[PDB]
Amino acid sequence: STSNSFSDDWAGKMDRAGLGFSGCSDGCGGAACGCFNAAPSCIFWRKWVEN
């Protein structure tokens, strides 16, 4: 049930961010995918709105 998709690196802790949804997706493995071991990579994504 972990919905806190914030690995102490996202910029969601701001006053100008607004409303959003902490989501996540899957990635690929390999040298071109960013790792050196065949395994599904945890890739987090965050979207919001601005004015």
């Binding site: 690929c28 493995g29 390999g30 065949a38």
Partner: protein
């Protein structure tokens, strides 16, 4: 074709054996096997699909 990234559902390779043989037959279809297989020059309908 290693795991951890490759995806297959089921029933893509068959097994056959009579007496300690365990022979495997091929069932995967190539690209030039399905119907409606066109080429680089295509004139289906009014559109002329070029490259």
């Amino acid at each position: 074709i290693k795991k951890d990234g490759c995806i297959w559902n089921a029933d893509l390779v068959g097994i056959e054996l009579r007496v300690d043989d365990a022979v495997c037959y091929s069932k995967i279809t190539s690209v030039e096997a399905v119907a409606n297989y066109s080429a680089i020059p295509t004139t289906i309908g009014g559109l002329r699909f070029e490259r």
